[PDB]
Amino acid sequence: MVDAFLGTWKLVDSKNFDDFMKSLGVGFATRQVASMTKPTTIIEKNGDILTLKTHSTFKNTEISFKLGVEFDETTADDRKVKSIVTLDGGKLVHLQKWDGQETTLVRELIDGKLILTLTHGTAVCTRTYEKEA
Numbered sequence: 071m072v073d074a075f076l077g078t079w080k081l082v083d084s085k086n087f088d089d090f091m092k093s094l095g096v097g098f099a100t101r102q103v104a105s106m107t108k109p110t111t112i113i114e115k116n117g118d119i120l121t122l123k124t125h126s127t128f129k130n131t132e133i134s135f136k137l138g139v140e141f142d143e144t145t146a147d148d149r150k151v152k153s154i155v156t157l158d159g160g161k162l163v164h165l166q167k168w169d170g171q172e173t174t175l176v177r178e179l180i181d182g183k184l185i186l187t188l189t190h191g192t193a194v195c196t197r198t199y200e201k202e203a
């Protein structure tokens with residue numbers, strides 16, 4: 071039941087994204103631009119394939135996956151990872167693994183907003199997205 075996550079979403083709040091990016095070794099200049107960028111995230115399904123686009127003035131990504139099936143991914147910061155996305159407690163949980171490290175990207179719906187929690191190391195970033203009509 072991924073249905074309430076589908077659609078077009080725009081970033082409206084960000085907490086601790088610089089901490090998260092620093093933890094991943096992202097360079098200062100990229101952090102700097104990223105801290106002023108407001109992406110649009112588009113989540114689409116076709117049968118049990120989901121496609122998740124992240125669009126911005128800086129970087130752009132797109133992944134397609136089946137829930138519960140591992141896929142290769144190259145992240146916006148150029149990490150080559152092994153990924154899996156699953157529903158867990160009604161949350162869309164994306165786990166990335168590379169070099170023995172793990173990142174998680176957890177999405178949930180609260181009061182119609184999509185809350186993305188990004189964790190690497192001890193860093194925890196919370197980004198809030200709201201629907202675009």
Ligand SMILES: CCCCCCCCCCCCCCCC(=O)O
Nearest residue numbers: 091096104109124126129146147197
């Ligand atoms: C879409 C522009 C983001 C720019 C950040 C690039 C360097 C850090 C990337 C970290 C992993 C992906 C973070 C996604 C954040 C989000 O979807 O809001």
